Amino acid sequence: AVTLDKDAYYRRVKRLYSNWRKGEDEYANVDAIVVSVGVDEEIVYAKSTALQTWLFGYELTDTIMVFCDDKIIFMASKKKVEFLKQIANTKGNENANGAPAITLLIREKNESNKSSFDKMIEAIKESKNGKKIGVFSKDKFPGEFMKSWNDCLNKEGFDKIDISAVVAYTIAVKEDGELNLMKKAASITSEVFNKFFKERVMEIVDADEKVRHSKLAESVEKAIEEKKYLAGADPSTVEMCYPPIIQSGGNYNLKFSVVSDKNHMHFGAITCAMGIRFKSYCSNLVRTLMVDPSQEVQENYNFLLQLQEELLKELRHGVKICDVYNAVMDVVKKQKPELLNKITKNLGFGMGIEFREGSLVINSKNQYKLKKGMVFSINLGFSDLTNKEGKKPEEKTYALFIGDTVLVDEDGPATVLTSVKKKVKNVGIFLK
């Protein structure tokens, strides 16, 4: 009963084969592409499952995909194989040129899978030179099925070439349907921040509550189980991209790989990072809430806002990511040189099915050129700033962090998909 978007599959596997045949960078010496997923209880970010979601619309556990020059093999359970027959039996519809015919193999549950494994090995050895396979090196899923396959596969001594970075670029441009998913993700994130999170922080400050950052983060997690913030969306189609990160009181860490600590929230500079994943497509948002910020804090915050818009103006199709980076840093060197060693070393990253694309972060060295239809988290911060009027320890040090979900456009400045106002009028809390 689960429909596979056939047309989307044919377009995307065509893109994959086109880039692979073009043979630049990591694609150049690859004889076959081998992707396998095992057991996945935690739904982690992985190239292997991202590629599945891209091609099929869904993740498929205990599944192996082998892409050869004139054959494709998918191996999975009977039910997953039945699902895949929607694209394997082409019916003669002509959307199928540009990629090989599909062979489906059934994963036996309690019988040996040696014969199926042998078939796939043989296909690899027949594909192009038969010596080197393109793989996602980071990916290691648990379970019996992967163990048995990898034991079989490793006996052959194929050279393993990581193709994560080129596959990242191959799938980075979003189709309109995917854009719609990321737009909905972005608007849910915005609604949660606007209607739940900001009100909650406001409550806490007005009542002088003592709340641990970890507890506040939990409440944000619970909030998306409530349909009142989901604008019609099925609750089961919505997840957090990462546990919400709230920091304050001199203890900051302006990245997305750390969790909220257990300290009580301080009323000063409160950085708030959260993102919704809607039907496996990610969004991101960072806002800093400030209690009675001084003139000097506001001046820094407004400069941060200025840098962000400058970045968006430069984030255009055809320009190199590192040139964007340098244009923004030039503004810092020219206008506020004292902030050069305070600003985040990354100014954002490519975003999609996977939250943070490692080969597409905006830093000084990234050579990849932007294309229309790429979506980014654009994130900029200043840390280790001194509030000279602070008396308590928790008051002396602050940080400022903003972040938006952004689309590289047809022409001109990048378009913002998130919708949360961020002038000090909107994120300042004034107690007097």
Coordinates of all heavy atoms in Angstrom, one line a residue, residues 359-416, unseen atoms left out:
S359 N 31.2 18.1 4.1 CA 32.0 18.6 3.0 C 31.4 19.9 2.5 O 31.9 20.5 1.5 CB 32.0 17.6 1.8 OG 30.7 17.3 1.4
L360 N 30.3 20.4 3.1 CA 29.8 21.7 2.6 C 29.6 22.7 3.8 O 28.6 23.4 3.9 CB 28.4 21.5 2.0 CG 28.4 20.7 0.6 CD1 27.0 20.4 0.2 CD2 29.2 21.4 -0.5
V361 N 30.6 22.8 4.7 CA 30.5 23.9 5.7 C 31.2 25.1 5.1 O 32.2 25.0 4.4 CB 31.0 23.4 7.1 CG1 31.4 21.9 7.1 CG2 32.1 24.3 7.6
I362 N 30.7 26.2 5.5 CA 31.2 27.5 5.1 C 32.4 27.9 5.9 O 32.3 28.4 7.0 CB 30.2 28.6 5.1 CG1 28.9 28.1 4.4 CG2 30.7 29.9 4.6 CD1 27.7 29.0 4.5
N363 N 33.6 27.6 5.4 CA 34.9 28.0 6.1 C 35.9 28.5 5.0 O 35.5 28.6 3.9 CB 35.4 26.8 6.8 CG 35.6 25.5 6.0 OD1 35.9 25.6 4.8 ND2 35.3 24.4 6.6
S364 N 37.1 28.7 5.5 CA 38.1 29.4 4.6 C 38.6 28.5 3.5 O 39.3 29.0 2.6 CB 39.3 29.8 5.5 OG 39.9 28.7 6.1
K365 N 38.4 27.2 3.5 CA 39.0 26.3 2.5 C 38.0 25.6 1.5 O 38.5 25.0 0.6 CB 39.8 25.3 3.2 CG 40.8 25.9 4.2 CD 42.1 26.4 3.4 CE 43.4 25.7 4.0 NZ 44.5 25.6 2.9
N366 N 36.7 25.8 1.7 CA 35.8 25.0 0.9 C 35.7 25.5 -0.5 O 35.4 26.7 -0.8 CB 34.4 25.1 1.5 CG 33.5 23.9 1.1 OD1 33.6 23.6 -0.1 ND2 32.7 23.4 2.0
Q367 N 36.1 24.6 -1.5 CA 36.2 25.0 -2.9 C 34.9 24.8 -3.6 O 34.8 25.2 -4.8 CB 37.3 24.2 -3.5 CG 38.7 24.4 -2.9 CD 39.2 25.8 -3.1 OE1 39.4 26.3 -4.2 NE2 39.3 26.6 -2.0
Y368 N 33.9 24.1 -3.1 CA 32.7 23.7 -3.8 C 31.9 25.0 -4.1 O 31.8 25.9 -3.3 CB 31.8 22.8 -3.0 CG 32.3 21.4 -2.9 CD1 32.9 20.8 -1.8 CD2 32.0 20.5 -4.0 CE1 33.4 19.5 -1.8 CE2 32.4 19.2 -4.0 CZ 33.1 18.7 -2.9 OH 33.5 17.4 -2.9
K369 N 31.4 25.0 -5.4 CA 30.6 26.2 -5.8 C 29.1 25.9 -5.5 O 28.6 24.8 -5.6 CB 30.8 26.4 -7.3 CG 32.2 26.7 -7.7 CD 32.5 26.4 -9.2 CE 32.3 27.6 -10.0 NZ 33.5 27.8 -10.9
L370 N 28.5 27.0 -5.1 CA 27.0 27.0 -4.8 C 26.2 26.8 -6.0 O 26.6 27.2 -7.1 CB 26.6 28.3 -4.1 CG 27.4 28.5 -2.8 CD1 27.3 30.0 -2.4 CD2 26.8 27.6 -1.8
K371 N 25.1 26.1 -5.9 CA 24.1 26.0 -7.0 C 22.7 26.4 -6.5 O 22.4 26.2 -5.3 CB 24.1 24.6 -7.5 CG 25.4 24.2 -8.2 CD 25.2 22.8 -8.8 CE 26.4 22.4 -9.6 NZ 26.5 20.9 -9.8
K372 N 21.9 27.0 -7.4 CA 20.5 27.2 -7.1 C 19.8 25.9 -6.6 O 20.0 24.8 -7.2 CB 19.8 27.7 -8.4
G373 N 19.0 26.1 -5.5 CA 18.3 24.9 -5.0 C 19.0 24.2 -3.8 O 18.4 23.4 -3.2
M374 N 20.3 24.6 -3.6 CA 20.9 24.1 -2.3 C 20.4 24.8 -1.1 O 20.1 26.0 -1.1 CB 22.4 24.3 -2.4 CG 23.1 23.4 -3.4 SD 24.9 23.8 -3.6 CE 25.6 22.9 -2.2
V375 N 20.2 24.1 0.0 CA 19.7 24.7 1.2 C 20.8 24.6 2.3 O 21.5 23.6 2.4 CB 18.4 24.0 1.8 CG1 18.0 24.4 3.2 CG2 17.3 24.2 0.8
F376 N 20.9 25.7 3.1 CA 22.0 25.8 4.1 C 21.4 26.2 5.5 O 20.4 26.9 5.5 CB 23.0 26.8 3.7 CG 24.0 26.4 2.7 CD1 23.7 26.2 1.4 CD2 25.3 26.1 3.2 CE1 24.7 25.8 0.5 CE2 26.3 25.6 2.3 CZ 26.0 25.5 0.9
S377 N 22.1 25.7 6.5 CA 21.9 26.4 7.8 C 23.0 27.5 7.8 O 24.2 27.2 7.7 CB 22.1 25.5 9.0 OG 21.8 26.1 10.2
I378 N 22.6 28.8 7.9 CA 23.6 29.9 8.0 C 23.7 30.3 9.5 O 22.8 30.9 10.0 CB 23.1 31.0 7.1 CG1 23.0 30.6 5.6 CG2 24.0 32.2 7.3 CD1 24.4 30.1 5.1
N379 N 24.9 30.0 10.1 CA 25.1 30.3 11.5 C 26.3 31.1 11.8 O 27.4 30.8 11.3 CB 25.2 28.9 12.2 CG 24.4 27.8 11.6 OD1 24.8 27.2 10.7 ND2 23.1 27.7 12.1
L380 N 26.1 32.1 12.6 CA 27.2 33.0 12.9 C 27.1 33.3 14.4 O 26.1 33.6 14.9 CB 27.2 34.3 12.1 CG 27.2 34.3 10.6 CD1 25.8 34.3 10.1 CD2 28.0 35.5 10.0
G381 N 28.3 33.3 15.1 CA 28.3 33.7 16.5 C 29.6 34.4 16.9 O 30.6 34.4 16.2
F382 N 29.5 35.2 18.0 CA 30.7 35.7 18.7 C 30.7 35.0 20.1 O 29.7 35.0 20.8 CB 30.6 37.2 18.9 CG 30.4 38.0 17.6 CD1 29.5 39.0 17.5 CD2 31.3 37.7 16.5 CE1 29.4 39.8 16.3 CE2 31.2 38.5 15.4 CZ 30.2 39.5 15.2
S383 N 31.8 34.5 20.5 CA 31.9 34.0 21.9 C 33.0 34.7 22.6 O 33.7 35.5 22.1 CB 32.1 32.5 21.9 OG 33.4 32.2 21.3
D384 N 33.1 34.4 23.9 CA 34.1 35.0 24.8 C 34.1 36.5 24.7 O 35.1 37.2 24.7 CB 35.5 34.5 24.5 CG 35.6 33.0 24.5 OD1 35.5 32.4 25.6 OD2 35.9 32.4 23.5
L385 N 32.9 37.1 24.8 CA 32.7 38.5 24.9 C 32.6 38.9 26.3 O 32.0 38.2 27.1 CB 31.5 39.0 24.1 CG 31.5 38.6 22.6 CD1 30.2 39.1 22.0 CD2 32.7 39.1 21.9
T386 N 33.2 40.0 26.7 CA 33.1 40.5 28.1 C 32.1 41.6 28.2 O 32.2 42.6 27.5 CB 34.5 41.0 28.5 OG1 35.5 40.0 28.3 CG2 34.5 41.4 30.0
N387 N 31.2 41.4 29.2 CA 30.3 42.4 29.6 C 31.0 43.1 30.8 O 31.0 42.6 31.9 CB 29.0 41.9 30.0 CG 28.0 42.9 30.4 OD1 28.0 44.1 29.9 ND2 27.1 42.6 31.3
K388 N 31.5 44.3 30.5 CA 32.3 45.0 31.5 C 31.5 45.5 32.7 O 32.1 45.8 33.8 CB 33.0 46.2 30.9 CG 32.1 47.1 30.1 CD 32.5 48.6 30.3 CE 31.8 49.5 29.2 NZ 30.5 49.9 29.7
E389 N 30.2 45.5 32.6 CA 29.4 45.9 33.7 C 29.0 44.7 34.6 O 28.4 44.9 35.7 CB 28.1 46.7 33.2 CG 28.3 48.2 33.1 CD 29.4 48.8 34.0 OE1 29.4 48.5 35.2 OE2 30.3 49.5 33.4
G390 N 29.2 43.5 34.1 CA 28.9 42.3 34.9 C 29.7 42.3 36.2 O 30.9 42.7 36.2
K391 N 29.0 42.0 37.3 CA 29.6 41.9 38.6 C 29.8 40.4 39.0 O 31.0 40.0 39.3 CB 28.8 42.6 39.6 CG 28.6 44.1 39.3 CD 30.0 44.8 39.4 CE 29.8 46.3 39.3 NZ 29.4 46.7 37.8
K392 N 28.8 39.6 39.0 CA 28.9 38.2 39.2 C 29.6 37.5 38.1 O 29.7 38.0 37.0 CB 27.5 37.6 39.3 CG 26.6 38.2 40.4 CD 25.3 37.3 40.6 CE 25.7 35.8 40.5 NZ 24.6 35.0 39.9
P393 N 30.2 36.3 38.4 CA 30.9 35.6 37.3 C 30.0 35.3 36.1 O 30.4 35.5 35.0 CB 31.3 34.3 38.0 CG 31.4 34.6 39.5 CD 30.3 35.7 39.7
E394 N 28.8 34.8 36.4 CA 27.8 34.4 35.3 C 27.5 35.6 34.4 O 26.9 35.4 33.3 CB 26.6 33.9 36.0
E395 N 27.8 36.8 34.8 CA 27.5 38.0 34.1 C 28.6 38.6 33.2 O 28.4 39.4 32.3 CB 27.0 39.1 35.1 CG 25.8 38.8 35.8 CD 25.5 39.8 37.0 OE1 26.4 40.6 37.3 OE2 24.4 39.8 37.5
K396 N 29.9 38.2 33.6 CA 31.0 38.8 32.9 C 31.2 38.4 31.5 O 31.7 39.1 30.7 CB 32.3 38.5 33.8
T397 N 30.9 37.1 31.2 CA 31.1 36.6 29.9 C 29.8 36.3 29.2 O 28.9 35.6 29.7 CB 32.0 35.3 30.0 OG1 33.3 35.6 30.4 CG2 32.0 34.6 28.6
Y398 N 29.7 36.7 27.9 CA 28.5 36.3 27.2 C 28.9 36.0 25.7 O 30.0 36.1 25.3 CB 27.4 37.5 27.2 CG 27.8 38.7 26.3 CD1 27.3 38.9 25.1 CD2 28.7 39.6 26.8 CE1 27.6 40.0 24.3 CE2 29.1 40.7 26.1 CZ 28.5 40.9 24.9 OH 28.9 42.0 24.1
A399 N 27.9 35.4 25.0 CA 28.0 35.0 23.6 C 26.8 35.4 22.9 O 25.7 35.6 23.5 CB 28.4 33.5 23.5
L400 N 26.9 35.5 21.6 CA 25.8 35.8 20.7 C 25.8 34.9 19.5 O 26.8 34.7 18.9 CB 25.9 37.3 20.2 CG 25.9 38.4 21.3 CD1 26.2 39.7 20.7 CD2 24.6 38.4 22.1
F401 N 24.6 34.3 19.1 CA 24.6 33.2 18.1 C 23.2 33.4 17.3 O 22.2 33.4 17.9 CB 24.7 31.9 18.8 CG 25.1 30.7 18.0 CD1 25.7 30.9 16.8 CD2 24.9 29.4 18.4 CE1 26.2 29.8 16.0 CE2 25.3 28.3 17.6 CZ 25.9 28.5 16.4
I402 N 23.3 33.5 16.0 CA 22.1 33.5 15.2 C 22.2 32.4 14.1 O 23.3 32.1 13.7 CB 21.7 34.8 14.6 CG1 22.9 35.7 14.2 CG2 20.7 35.6 15.5 CD1 23.5 35.2 12.9
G403 N 21.1 32.0 13.6 CA 21.1 30.9 12.6 C 19.7 30.8 11.9 O 18.7 30.9 12.6
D404 N 19.8 30.6 10.6 CA 18.6 30.5 9.8 C 18.7 29.5 8.8 O 19.9 29.1 8.4 CB 18.2 31.9 9.2 CG 17.5 32.8 10.2 OD1 16.3 32.6 10.4 OD2 18.2 33.7 10.7
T405 N 17.6 28.9 8.3 CA 17.5 28.0 7.2 C 17.3 28.8 6.0 O 16.4 29.7 5.9 CB 16.4 27.0 7.4 OG1 16.7 26.2 8.6 CG2 16.3 26.1 6.2
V406 N 18.1 28.5 5.0 CA 18.3 29.4 3.8 C 18.4 28.7 2.5 O 18.9 27.6 2.4 CB 19.6 30.3 4.0 CG1 20.2 30.7 2.8 CG2 19.3 31.5 5.0
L407 N 17.8 29.2 1.4 CA 17.8 28.7 0.1 C 18.6 29.5 -0.9 O 18.4 30.7 -1.1 CB 16.3 28.6 -0.4 CG 16.1 28.2 -1.9 CD1 16.6 26.8 -2.3 CD2 14.7 28.4 -2.3
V408 N 19.6 28.9 -1.6 CA 20.3 29.5 -2.6 C 19.4 29.7 -3.8 O 18.8 28.8 -4.3 CB 21.6 28.7 -3.1 CG1 22.3 29.5 -4.2 CG2 22.5 28.5 -1.9
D409 N 19.3 31.0 -4.3 CA 18.2 31.3 -5.2 C 18.6 31.4 -6.7 O 19.8 31.4 -7.0 CB 17.5 32.6 -4.8 CG 16.0 32.5 -4.9 OD1 15.4 31.4 -4.6 OD2 15.3 33.5 -5.2
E410 N 17.6 31.4 -7.5 CA 17.8 31.6 -9.0 C 18.7 32.8 -9.3 O 19.7 32.7 -10.0 CB 16.4 31.8 -9.6 CG 16.4 31.3 -11.1 CD 15.7 29.9 -11.1 OE1 15.5 29.3 -10.1 OE2 15.5 29.4 -12.3
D411 N 18.4 33.9 -8.6 CA 19.1 35.2 -8.8 C 19.1 35.9 -7.5 O 18.1 36.0 -6.8 CB 18.5 36.0 -9.9 CG 19.3 37.3 -10.2 OD1 19.0 38.3 -9.6 OD2 20.2 37.2 -11.0
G412 N 20.3 36.6 -7.2 CA 20.3 37.5 -6.0 C 20.5 36.8 -4.7 O 20.8 35.6 -4.6
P413 N 20.2 37.6 -3.6 CA 20.5 37.1 -2.2 C 19.7 35.9 -1.9 O 18.6 35.6 -2.4 CB 20.0 38.3 -1.4 CG 20.2 39.5 -2.3 CD 19.9 39.0 -3.7
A414 N 20.3 35.1 -1.0 CA 19.6 33.8 -0.6 C 18.3 34.1 0.2 O 18.2 35.1 0.9 CB 20.6 33.0 0.2
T415 N 17.4 33.2 0.0 CA 16.0 33.4 0.6 C 16.0 32.7 2.0 O 16.5 31.6 2.1 CB 15.0 32.8 -0.3 OG1 14.8 33.7 -1.5 CG2 13.6 32.7 0.3
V416 N 15.4 33.3 3.0 CA 15.3 32.8 4.3 C 14.0 32.0 4.5 O 12.9 32.5 4.2 CB 15.3 33.9 5.4 CG1 15.3 33.2 6.8 CG2 16.6 34.7 5.2

